[model samples]
Target: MPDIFQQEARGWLRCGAPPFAGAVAGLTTKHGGESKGPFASLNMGLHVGDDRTDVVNNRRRLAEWLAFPLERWVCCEQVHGADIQKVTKSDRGNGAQDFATAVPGVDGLYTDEAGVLLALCFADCVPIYFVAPSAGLVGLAHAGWRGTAGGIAGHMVWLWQTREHIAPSDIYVAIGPAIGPCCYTVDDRVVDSLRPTLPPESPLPWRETSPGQYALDLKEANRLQLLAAGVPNSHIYVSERCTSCEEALFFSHRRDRGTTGRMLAFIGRREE
Candidate 1:
């Protein structure tokens, strides 16, 4: 656990326990950037009404830290769906500077090439990382309740297995920090939507707070989905920090009431 995620000099949170060999996987916090006000500094999302130049500069700061060019950072529109996009060298700079140019209609990005950084915006929604060093492939998925029920974790594993011909045992997943069940409460509708995603006999995805309210553990639900997809439980690393509980470290959509900034979650392999 010593190498889980240590904040570097500029406040960039890196995956110290990098599961994939020769790859750089990390997430940005609300620190070390040029945005202002509610966005403050280090707002990595361009669609959140932050200054365009500030957002671009923040991205440049991330690229500099990763030792890659800003033009190599590829992003998507992130519709919160289970659709996965296979990124190639030609897709290099899609949505790096703005939201309009980002790869549209996808929540998951997969690539086998080095130097192409796959990034997505997050504000409480789970960031799921998939890497197979032996197969030279990596994947990133944004999983909210909608995306989770659609099985983004399982969808990623399935893509790696079927498209890249990688085995489930070869895949390693790192579930990033997001909203924990502690501060996340929902009505019966969300709970009902999550039920069919997990095994019938498994632990209930939500706990009844009262008659029609429940507390949902989205991270656990995604972990179980990965397990069902044949990824060994030992290979998945779930972060304990809850976005809503730890206000200083992360931004929470529910906690902030949709008036907050978004953090960046990205994974890429450095070219040799």
Candidate 2:
């Protein structure tokens, strides 16, 4: 069973991991922000047409909740690609204070540095969190279907392995809440892209209710990729809560028909 993110604040849900003893990690909700309309409350995505002032205020609230400075938060444009950027202190606040300045066209952010908060926005897409406890490394990524097929989860493992020389076994990953197979129906276009990622001899990844149409379990596909990349199965944590499944708590693109708000998924090591 997937672990439920515990509510640590009015609108914050934390992963509640003892392994990351000194680090701060949590996800945002639509309950406590300044957005209106489709983005009624705490909508975190600035590019989604939420008022700039409201978005900024919401971000500030999140910063306060995490006890991290607003300027230290690092975010991205999140193009649903597999490109991962190794973050540093210099990159802090690139995408946090404004959207136009966000790390352009990248979907993954990784760093070994403390004091730099990594974040990604999501509605129905998966939020991938990474940490190497001994190495003091933490990271975040946004993985929609395109990124999933492009191998973003395994890419993070390989990145820390090759670049930072961190062993894959030491790296921990958390696959956060996302659109489940329950409501994520798709056509052959998305199904075809994810087909190659599944292991051979595995059961059909999608359930077909009609010809050429299926409901795909995106979380399982990503978990498998992490396993294939050498991350221990026991080290991975998957969430049971689905954004689409809980309409009152989250915003959904498909459920809202492309007009919806977004939530924030973030991770960072505190500077001692």
Candidate 3:
């Protein structure tokens, strides 16, 4: 498959599949900001130890470029759990400037309302983007091994189907930049936690690389979960960018040994 994420500007790459023409969905690169040292530039996570002024400046710059003001964005604390929050216009500006204000205990966020941007911070965690253009719905999920094993991707789809009355077939998903299997190895515990989340016929998204170790493809793992949730295979798009390997384009928690900054994944519909 061709790359689903295409560079739209200096630090942004826009999703090209399951197109939501009226919406803006993309991930940020670690460049073009005022941050210094390990946070260098374009680090979007306020929760990280980066200077508050620098993080805010980075966010403001991107908001200005996307033409979606910072106040319209809703962020989350991202506990790497399956809890998914349904956002509304009233939820705007939560965590836009500070970590304390972010929506608590959720890794997934969605909304059918326009003008409310759903944002999340990631380093190597898979950034999952969801859209059902026909239903006017868009969302984002932060899927680390914990979130993946807990089925955060499927949880988002389930929420939409039960609460919003949208069919799974109508939902489109884009698994954005993350640490691919090549650079991400885990032990039996992580693999065992994820096994139950896959569909019966789906192949494991991991391979034993050594004794008691496995190279786990988080993007593909989330894809399998989405398939199990009933989202059509054709509606899913995966980005080939690997955060740990693509050192120039991203900040990797694994590669940087926990001292790295974070890139932001954001999705929102532009008011027409």
Candidate 4:
């Protein structure tokens, strides 16, 4: 399948086919920033021990590129759980520059309110974007192994269905870059946690590479969860880019041995 994300500028990509024409959503690459060392440059994550000034400068650069200021961005602490937060304009800039102000312990964030970007940081974890354009809603989720197994993707869809009264068929999803199965090996413990979350008849998103070890397709796993939650397959798009494989484009914690920078995944509607 064709890639859904297209590089609009150096180190910046935008969703070429958003659910709504007014929606702006995409993930950042690890380039064009002020950091040094392991967190080399363009590191958007604040909790990763990088210099606060450098990360902020990198974020500001992205804000300038997207025309969305840092003060209007909302972030999360991202505990890798299934918790989803519904944010609004009032919550803008929560975690834009510092970790303390970010939404506590949530991996998923959504909003119908315009002008406030829902952002999350990732290094090898799948970044999931959701949009129900009819309802003016946009959402972002950080789906690492824990978040995927915990059903965070489906939870976001369920929230829109129940709270926002949007039909699953109307929801469009995009699964972003991450550590592909080609570079992601997991043990039985991870598989056991994920197996119960997948649909009974769904194609397994993993293959046993060795006894008690499997190459798990984390992106495909989240895609399956979204389908099981009622999202139409046609409405979903998955990126073929792999964070681990594309060392030049992304920061992979696995490949970098946990000492790496992070990319930001963001989505929001411009203020009318």
Per-candidate local distance difference test: 0.86, 0.87, 0.91, 0.91
TM-scores, each model vs. reference:
0.96, 0.96, 0.98, 0.98
What is the total number of backbone clashes in candidate 1?
Answer: 0
The list of candidate 2 runs beyond 4 A from truth reads none
Better of 1 and 3 by lDDT: 3
For all candidates, what are the clash counts? 0, 0, 0, 0
Provide the lowest-lDDT 10-residue window in model 2.
1-10
- Candidate 1 deviation (Cα RMSD): 1.3
- State candidate 3's TM-score: 0.98
**Could you give candidate 2's per-residue lDDT for residues 71-115 as a string of tens digits?**
998988899899999989999999897899999888999888999
Where does model 4 exceed 4 Å of error?
18-20
- Local accuracy of candidate 3 as per-residue lDDT tens digits, 1-272: 67888888579888877565668989998989999999989989898888999999999999999999999999999997889999899999999997899999999899989899999999999999999988899999999999988888999999999999999999998999999998999999999999888767779999998899999999999888888899998899899999999998899999999998999999999877
Candidate 4 CA-lDDT value: 0.91
Which run of 10 residues does model 4 get worst, by summed lDDT?
Answer: 13-22
lDDT of model 2, residue 233? 84
TM-score of 4: 0.98
The RMSD (Cα, Å) of candidate 2 is 1.3
TM-score: the better of candidates 1 and 3: 3
